[PDB]
Amino acid sequence: PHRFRPGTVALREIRKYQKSTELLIRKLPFQRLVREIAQDFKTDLRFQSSAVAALQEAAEAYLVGLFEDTNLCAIHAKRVTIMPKDIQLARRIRGERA
Amino acid sequence: FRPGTVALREIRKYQKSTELLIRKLPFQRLVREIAQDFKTDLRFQSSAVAALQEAAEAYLVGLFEDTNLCAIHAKRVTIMPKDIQLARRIRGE
Amino acid sequence: RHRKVLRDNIQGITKPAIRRLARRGGVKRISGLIYEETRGVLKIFLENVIRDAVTYTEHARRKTVTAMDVVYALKRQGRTLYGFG
Amino acid sequence: RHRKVLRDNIQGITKPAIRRLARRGGVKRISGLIYEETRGVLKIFLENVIRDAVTYTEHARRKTVTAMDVVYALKRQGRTLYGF
Amino acid sequence: SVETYKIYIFKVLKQVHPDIGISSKAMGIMNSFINDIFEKLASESSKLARYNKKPTITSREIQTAVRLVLPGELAKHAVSEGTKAVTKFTSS
Amino acid sequence: TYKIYIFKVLKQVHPDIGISSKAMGIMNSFINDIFEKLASESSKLARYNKKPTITSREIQTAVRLVLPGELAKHAVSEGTKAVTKFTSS
Amino acid sequence: RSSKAGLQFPVGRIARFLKAGKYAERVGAGAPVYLAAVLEYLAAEVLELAGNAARDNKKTRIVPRHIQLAVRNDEELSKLLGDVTIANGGVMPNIHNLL
Amino acid sequence: ATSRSSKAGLQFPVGRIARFLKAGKYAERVGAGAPVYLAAVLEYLAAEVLELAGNAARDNKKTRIVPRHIQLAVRNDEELSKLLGDVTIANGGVMPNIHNLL
Amino acid sequence: KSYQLKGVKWLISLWQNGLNGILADQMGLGKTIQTIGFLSHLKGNGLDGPYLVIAPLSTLSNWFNEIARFTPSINAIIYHGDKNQRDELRRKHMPKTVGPKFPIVITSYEVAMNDAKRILRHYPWKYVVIDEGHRLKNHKCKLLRELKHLKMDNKLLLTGTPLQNNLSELWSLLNFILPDIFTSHDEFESQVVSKLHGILRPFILRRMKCDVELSLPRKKEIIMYATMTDHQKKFQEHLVNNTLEAHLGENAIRGQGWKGKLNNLVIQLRKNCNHPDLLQGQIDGSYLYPPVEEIVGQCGKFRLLERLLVRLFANNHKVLIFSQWTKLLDIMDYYFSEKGFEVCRIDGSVKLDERRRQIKDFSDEKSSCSIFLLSTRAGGLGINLTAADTCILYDSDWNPQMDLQAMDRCHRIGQTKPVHVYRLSTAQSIETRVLKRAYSKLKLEHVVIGQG
Amino acid sequence: KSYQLKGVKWLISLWQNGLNGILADQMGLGKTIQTIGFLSHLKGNGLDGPYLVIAPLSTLSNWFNEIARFTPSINAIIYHGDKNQRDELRRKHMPKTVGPKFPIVITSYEVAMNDAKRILRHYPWKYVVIDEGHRLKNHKCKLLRELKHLKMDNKLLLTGTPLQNNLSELWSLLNFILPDIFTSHDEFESQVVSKLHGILRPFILRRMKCDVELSLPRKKEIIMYATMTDHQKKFQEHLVNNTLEAHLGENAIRGQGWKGKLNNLVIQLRKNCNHPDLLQGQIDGSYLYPPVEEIVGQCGKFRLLERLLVRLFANNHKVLIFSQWTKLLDIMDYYFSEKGFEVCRIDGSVKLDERRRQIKDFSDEKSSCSIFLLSTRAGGLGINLTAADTCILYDSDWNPQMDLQAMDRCHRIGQTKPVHVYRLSTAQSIETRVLKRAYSKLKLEHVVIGQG
DNA sequence: TCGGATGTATATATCTGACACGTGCCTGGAGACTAGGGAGTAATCCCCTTGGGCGGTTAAACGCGGGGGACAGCGCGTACGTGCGTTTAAGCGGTGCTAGAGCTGTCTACGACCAATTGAGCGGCCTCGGCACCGGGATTCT
DNA sequence: AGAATCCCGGTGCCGAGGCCGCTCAATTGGTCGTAGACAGCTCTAGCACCGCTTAAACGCACGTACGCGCTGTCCCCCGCGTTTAACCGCCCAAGGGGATTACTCCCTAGTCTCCAGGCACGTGTCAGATATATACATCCGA
Ligand SMILES: Nc1ncnc2c1ncn2[C@@H]1O[C@H](COP(=O)(O)OP(=O)(O)O)[C@@H](O)[C@H]1O
Numbered sequence A: 001p002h003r004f005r006p007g008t009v010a011l012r013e014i015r016k017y018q019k020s021t022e023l024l025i026r027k028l029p030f031q032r033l034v035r036e037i038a039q040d041f042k043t044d045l046r047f048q049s050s051a052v053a054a055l056q057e058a059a060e061a062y063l064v065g066l067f068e069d070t071n072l073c074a075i076h077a078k079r080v081t082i083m084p085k086d087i088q089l090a091r092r093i094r095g096e097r098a
Numbered sequence B: 001f002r003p004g005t006v007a008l009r010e011i012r013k014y015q016k017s018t019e020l021l022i023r024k025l026p027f028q029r030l031v032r033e034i035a036q037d038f039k040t041d042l043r044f045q046s047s048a049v050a051a052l053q054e055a056a057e058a059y060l061v062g063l064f065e066d067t068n069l070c071a072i073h074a075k076r077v078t079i080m081p082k083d084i085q086l087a088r089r090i091r092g093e
Numbered sequence C: 001r002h003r004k005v006l007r008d009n010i011q012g013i014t015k016p017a018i019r020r021l022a023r024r025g026g027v028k029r030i031s032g033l034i035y036e037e038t039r040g041v042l043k044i045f046l047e048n049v050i051r052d053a054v055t056y057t058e059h060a061r062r063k064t065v066t067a068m069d070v071v072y073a074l075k076r077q078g079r080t081l082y083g084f085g
Numbered sequence D: 001r002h003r004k005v006l007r008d009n010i011q012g013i014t015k016p017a018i019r020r021l022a023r024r025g026g027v028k029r030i031s032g033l034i035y036e037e038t039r040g041v042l043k044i045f046l047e048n049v050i051r052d053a054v055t056y057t058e059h060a061r062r063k064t065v066t067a068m069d070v071v072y073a074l075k076r077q078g079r080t081l082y083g084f
Numbered sequence E: 001s002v003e004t005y006k007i008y009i010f011k012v013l014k015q016v017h018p019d020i021g022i023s024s025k026a027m028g029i030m031n032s033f034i035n036d037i038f039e040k041l042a043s044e045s046s047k048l049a050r051y052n053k054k055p056t057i058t059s060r061e062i063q064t065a066v067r068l069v070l071p072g073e074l075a076k077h078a079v080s081e082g083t084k085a086v087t088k089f090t091s092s
Numbered sequence F: 001t002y003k004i005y006i007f008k009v010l011k012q013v014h015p016d017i018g019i020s021s022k023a024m025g026i027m028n029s030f031i032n033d034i035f036e037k038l039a040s041e042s043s044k045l046a047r048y049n050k051k052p053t054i055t056s057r058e059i060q061t062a063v064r065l066v067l068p069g070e071l072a073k074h075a076v077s078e079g080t081k082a083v084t085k086f087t088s089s
Numbered sequence G: 001r002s003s004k005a006g007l008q009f010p011v012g013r014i015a016r017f018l019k020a021g022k023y024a025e026r027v028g029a030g031a032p033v034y035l036a037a038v039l040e041y042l043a044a045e046v047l048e049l050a051g052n053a054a055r056d057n058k059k060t061r062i063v064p065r066h067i068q069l070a071v072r073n074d075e076e077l078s079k080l081l082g083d084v085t086i087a088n089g090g091v092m093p094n095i096h097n098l099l
Numbered sequence H: 001a002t003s004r005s006s007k008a009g010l011q012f013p014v015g016r017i018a019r020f021l022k023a024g025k026y027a028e029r030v031g032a033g034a035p036v037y038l039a040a041v042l043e044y045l046a047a048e049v050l051e052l053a054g055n056a057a058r059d060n061k062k063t064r065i066v067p068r069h070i071q072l073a074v075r076n077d078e079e080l081s082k083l084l085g086d087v088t089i090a091n092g093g094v095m096p097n098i099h100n101l102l
Numbered sequence I, J: 001k002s003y004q005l006k007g008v009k010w011l012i013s014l015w016q017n018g019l020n021g022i023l024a025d026q027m028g029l030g031k032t033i034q035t036i037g038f039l040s041h042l043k044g045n046g047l048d049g050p051y052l053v054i055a056p057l058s059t060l061s062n063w064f065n066e067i068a069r070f071t072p073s074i075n076a077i078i079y080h081g082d083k084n085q086r087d088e089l090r091r092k093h094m095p096k097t098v099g100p101k102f103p104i105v106i107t108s109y110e111v112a113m114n115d116a117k118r119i120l121r122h123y124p125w126k127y128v129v130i131d132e133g134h135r136l137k138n139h140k141c142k143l144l145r146e147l148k149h150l151k152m153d154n155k156l157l158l159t160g161t162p163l164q165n166n167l168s169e170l171w172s173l174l175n176f177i178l179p180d181i182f183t184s185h186d187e188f189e190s191q192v193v194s195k196l197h198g199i200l201r202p203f204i205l206r207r208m209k210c211d212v213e214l215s216l217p218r219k220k221e222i223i224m225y226a227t228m229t230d231h232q233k234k235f236q237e238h239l240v241n242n243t244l245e246a247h248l249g250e251n252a253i254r255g256q257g258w259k260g261k262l263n264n265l266v267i268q269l270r271k272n273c274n275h276p277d278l279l280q281g282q283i284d285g286s287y288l289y290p291p292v293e294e295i296v297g298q299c300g301k302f303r304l305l306e307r308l309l310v311r312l313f314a315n316n317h318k319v320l321i322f323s324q325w326t327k328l329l330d331i332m333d334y335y336f337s338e339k340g341f342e343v344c345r346i347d348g349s350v351k352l353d354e355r356r357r358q359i360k361d362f363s364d365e366k367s368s369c370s371i372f373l374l375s376t377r378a379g380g381l382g383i384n385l386t387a388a389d390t391c392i393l394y395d396s397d398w399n400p401q402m403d404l405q406a407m408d409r410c411h412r413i414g415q416t417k418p419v420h421v422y423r424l425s426t427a428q429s430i431e432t433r434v435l436k437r438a439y440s441k442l443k444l445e446h447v448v449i450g451q452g
Numbered sequence K: 001t002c003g004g005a006t007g008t009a010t011a012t013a014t015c016t017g018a019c020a021c022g023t024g025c026c027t028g029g030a031g032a033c034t035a036g037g038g039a040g041t042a043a044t045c046c047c048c049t050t051g052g053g054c055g056g057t058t059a060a061a062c063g064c065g066g067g068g069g070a071c072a073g074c075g076c077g078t079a080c081g082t083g084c085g086t087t088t089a090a091g092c093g094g095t096g097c098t099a100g101a102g103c104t105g106t107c108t109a110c111g112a113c114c115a116a117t118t119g120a121g122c123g124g125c126c127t128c129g130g131c132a133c134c135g136g137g138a139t140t141c142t
Numbered sequence L: 001a002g003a004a005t006c007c008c009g010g011t012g013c014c015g016a017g018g019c020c021g022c023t024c025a026a027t028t029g030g031t032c033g034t035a036g037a038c039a040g041c042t043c044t045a046g047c048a049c050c051g052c053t054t055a056a057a058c059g060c061a062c063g064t065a066c067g068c069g070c071t072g073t074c075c076c077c078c079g080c081g082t083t084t085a086a087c088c089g090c091c092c093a094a095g096g097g098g099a100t101t102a103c104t105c106c107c108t109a110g111t112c113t114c115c116a117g118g119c120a121c122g123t124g125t126c127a128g129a130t131a132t133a134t135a136c137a138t139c140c141g142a
């Protein structure tokens, strides 16, 4: 058996996913999610197929932006691991809900 | 008194008041020098310099109280210039 | 007794996909409690945007959320998006 | 030899004032390197606002910065100011 | 020469707290708040009429300006009260 | 759309580079966004002074307010050069 | 006019303001009525909270501090006035992990 | 019948800009130099972004600009990254950034 | 077999003029035999060449079986699966060298479509034969695009129902089977009936169930309505009006505020008319199947099935059951399995080789698994069940020709016992609307038959 | 002293009718030596009741000194300073009980204004006496508001120049010294000259320098212009056009891009005409004072001062120097101190008791500190310098009466040697503009004197 | 420090499906007159920002203990990364069915424009008490 | 101990509330184009269920290295007291500057008349994609 040391296959993933431009969530569960969410405000709705695409591509650019600064909170605290504390700090000094 | 006990006196005293914490004349002199590099021979209304100080002090107080969340997140009580930079990094400035 | 039993659509955002998003964000290690925090902070974002989009739709007397309703809802909340009209 | 030697206006914001601001922020201990960092972020913030408040004044052909130019300059930057 | 909302806010305050009065600084704060909200709702109504192709600002798009500008539980009351007035205005 | 004109400008700076169908959509969106930012800033500038006309001084102040420093400094010169050539020539 | 509607705000002045600012070409008849009702509602909800904060301090006249406290307690108003600074308005008292 | 653009020496449509300024009624009247000024500014900004994007495409040894190149050019430059601070170019991606062991 | 000898006389003829043909032989008449007969007629006269057969998954198996029983030795091979198909590709025979060992290539519509590249390389195919022509009845289907990449010097189409929906399916096929008379201009047929019979006499070849053999006993297709019970009426109104998601939401054990399924009320009314449990079990999101196990009797159509079946066990002749969905067949299975009946079932969810052995067991006369659940498209095409004798179509719609192909499954050369068909339905209901639509579609079908 | 005996005859009279008066006695005589005489006239028998005296800091000292030398025993006390004033307040004497030990209360305008509360409590003051009436020439000055809180049953005003600027200062005083003359209607004076002399004969009491006794030989006020040198002309043009902040910025050792001091030119071109170093010292930090020490000769007005002074050392009679600012006196001191002359100086920056002893030393005839720098408002009011003999006004403006009060400083009862005055100035310059304005102000002053 | 497992990095091809003209009109340009007024460029009175001073009096600056908080190091053990063998399930083809978006045609009601009123509000008169504002003593405190 | 603090009597005074004479705003009544809502026809997408592939998700086992706690050292920040100098300051003065109103012009409205653009649709020509192949470069463990 030939194993890699912990954290070397993670760094080639960072390089892999920071060169591509693809859309990283499965398309059907995301649509079911947005339909479930919209099922409250109005019932029996229809979604133009290019609107769920706009939603998905607006929602991942938000999570990618939140992760790259919950990772500044972890390095400020002398770590390399992210916990929910970092997300809450980042969201609270952004005012996302404060 | 022991180190750290008349500080909390100051946190309590200054969070009740409403008055201005920077002296007026040096602040006026500063805002006048940092406008000489946009437009020479400029005058200010007296209410224009009172409005700049109200906004600047509010900005600094608001920045100090999330600079303090970063220091506590790192398990400290002392604010360091590293904390201000983390706070401004995420707010976008 | 047999039947199907469905799963919370929010559970359809799987752990591998969240790890992929974190990798694109630059993260090296993930704690095991991140996933239920991310699942909850995605729902809030979607609720806000969809609540604005449906309001735009119902103003037009339409029954189909379209692609400007979304782009207008996004531009209103500080999030300008290029590439959809 | 015995003449007027001036100082950078930047200093008129004194260490006690910065400590009062930090105390109203909730801070308990302050390092000694905070003062020159605060004194530098304040200038950046202030010269971002004065630059727009003077542009709003040059348009109107005035020579006096009024309290309304400053309010508009602050509203341009996402912060609203009630009461003037 | 200078028109404000002083009379109307004062009358509303006497309607809410019959005995409390208000100073001048707070009165200015309240005047500014009303101007801010008016500007917000009006600009959103104009822009939202512009998204559709209509040159008229009716009441039903003061509805949706309110639903976009006001948050949650605040709007659900305001909207209701608005409808109230309009009914009492027309079936009068 | 502005696509025609956008293409012209490209053939002035890179006579041998082309553009993908999606990149032209991006450029169209960018032009439409900037135009509306500038035209609304000019509207506010005119309303704050109670004037009913948007001349080429409202556009200049809108450019100074909207574009970042070094970018605005060059946009102003381009525009004033255009207006001078328009009226004089 | 604006006595037939049960409002306390001026519908006529609101309409003058709406037609002066040239937000559109034509202004309907229910628009100033609607906009004047939703302004007195917000004024009435801020003033009640401010008066309540006045009553606790054993005061009979509201001051800017009372508006500040009333806005920063309630969740909806603080969300609406999230970037406003009430002049001469202090801060909401709070201390973190210490005596 | 010379067009306004040729008189102004531009490549953008001065007349179509003037119509767009009228429609929407941003105000009541519109001067004769406003659309010329606005078109000149729009052309300037377009040429700025397109030049940076073309350089980025040559750097990647290509000859056709795609969204990735616009993303690279915008988020490398200073003033453009300030201006387009909070915009999402679609089908672009973030630039490489690894910090510390992470 | 005489007809089948006229079936091989006409495909040897087609081979001659260099023409292509649509073998629309009656379904249930032995079309497949004839095919391997033509394939032996050529197999040994210097007609060695790349030969390719494409068909539905279910039939591929039956075909191999038939080869193993009718023809003494036809080099043949079933190219089914992926990655495991790569080895047999070469342990098949030389790459392009065609010898007396080059084995007949049998593939599926997926395989053919997904990896045409592999077979694209092969020589002009002597004869590509497509078992179910109905698959290509759309002229924009991706299979058709990928099927043109093949270099084919001859084509052939097997079917039993050439036209089902309208004339445009006839149009798309023609262009394919025969690019010669394509006429991509809406066609000129639209007196004219005779003019169409001039173009179509040359290729189309159809027979009939009556043919000559008195061996074929006749069948009886009879509609036996049922009366919608009270509870179903309550469910139907709460939908015709509304607040069903809530009146039933009164329980809503799961998925609180269950999404108003107020889409195509018709469908959400057909599901009711099938069995109300379908609409109940989602709103409530409960786990336990019918609690009393008898509430199943609340469904009127269920109760008419039960009594029919008790009277048909009085004789024991094996039955056949068809449905449109698979949730409903599942309810049925639950119900009967509680009583204890042994059932066999082949829907689309079940695997291929798994379903092939189930038949091989159902076909075992000694075994007493009389009941046989079977969904329409699931396995209503290509399966011999001479063992069974009666077909019950619980529900079927939108295309009448879909149903027929099933009835024949039971009724096919070798079925000695006379066949009945029981198209159940509910009187004065959404079902009758569909029934009438189907009659309309048939009306068109009978105008087509007069054409014949 | 006869005049001073008519000075005490008229304030005993004022005491009688119950009237209030403006002792506008000529400056440089009597006044002080007249006030304490009236104060002994009443301290005898009439006592002091609560008696309060307010005056400029410089005079308070001279007054104590005079008391210590003219009156044998007048309980008196100088209430100067803060916090240390609290102890002497009670170690003064009983609180309100006025006895033969109740000491005369001497305060300053700051003390009086800042803590009137303390003295507000005291009884109706028998006589409040304000040394320099000019302090109250504005009717909105905060001192006046705080001076009314005192319960005063009598008022008195000492001055030597009642009106300086215009008639409204006469208006504000009247209302104060005598509220019987409220006349808060712009006054009715505006032939009329005689009508004004009817109102003012009753209170105002003015005498002259000539009076009767020869005493002080006539003085001579003479204007000796100077020719602006080349360098000053260069500075003036770069100021009148522009780019001075930059041409001089060519050096700009400190404060890079030094703020354009383009404040109407008036605030600057005079500074040039005083000495160009003032401008150079700011645009460029120049920590070192003109090191050449002959660059001071570039100033034409400086060179005319130097030669004048060399010719006035030929006799050694002590000089007096006045200026408007304190930077310029500083330059002068630097210059002379380099040569070695011993100088004494009292501006507003120096402290009170410190400046009092400096005089006591300057007044020492044996000591050879002949030169005496002195800024106008600094110490141009209340100081006896009989030791000196010549006054040089480097620069003074905006109010001519400001200058006169200085000249008299040297020229006052006891000055035996005849006095000269040298108002230096630069010909054809901004200075002449001011000179003419001053002449205009005097013109008004002489129309006022004709009134007298 | 070598030698090996792979991982990315260069080079062969095909293969789309997109990029690249071409055309043909229709709606928007530009051009020419006329009208009204909206700026433009004056002339005047003022309230108002801009220097000196000058005191002066808390606040700032400086210095000195001395402890308590930051930071480094060390040990333990627990939770997360790597790789492998199933299991869904998304992700594709095919099959249907109205539903709801888009445009046009037609009339009735509704909002801009304009005359003649008149009672709302705004700027400026007074007047009194709810803010403060001071000492002066009982109570916590660490 | 020696240090911290609220409440309760004593203090003014000037800003909030009333009054007001008013004049220009908002109301009532009229007229009238042109927007509304409706109505109808067309027919282009959302969607809705079922059947196959294969790629991705999921579970699992090990092992290790990173998080977290404990201890020690030292340095720098805090609290206190003295002395200096600065902001909140009283006064001085000129020119400024800022919102006022003036005939005057020319510069934007429009109403129209046609040449001109552009946008849509119909075709090819790829070029950057992708897959197989080949080195050239790097983690890894000993
Ligand atoms: N010529 C024949 N010889 C022998 N058996 C036959 C013949 N034709 C039909 N059969 C029997 O009848 C069955 C049904 O015929 P089949 O070829 O399967 O029909 P289909 O045309 O539907 O494929 C066959 O499987 C076989 O058992």
Ligand SMILES: Nc1ncnc2c1ncn2[C@@H]1O[C@H](COP(=O)(O)OP(=O)(O)O)[C@@H](O)[C@H]1O
Binding pocket: J001, J004, J027, J028, J029, J030, J031, J032, J033, J384, J412, J413, J414
């Ligand atoms: N009556 C007098 N008796 C003695 N010496 C006098 C008399 N009058 C004036 N002097 C002298 O002349 C000086 C100047 O008079 P003074 O009273 O100081 O003038 P001022 O009126 O300016 O205060 C006195 O200090 C004193 O030396």
Ligand code: BEF
Binding pocket: I027, I028, I031, I032, I059, I381, I382, I383, I384
């Ligand atoms: F092969 Be047959 F059509 F069942």
Ligand code: BEF
Binding pocket: J027, J028, J031, J032, J059, J381, J382, J383, J384
């Ligand atoms: F006291 Be005097 F006026 F010098």
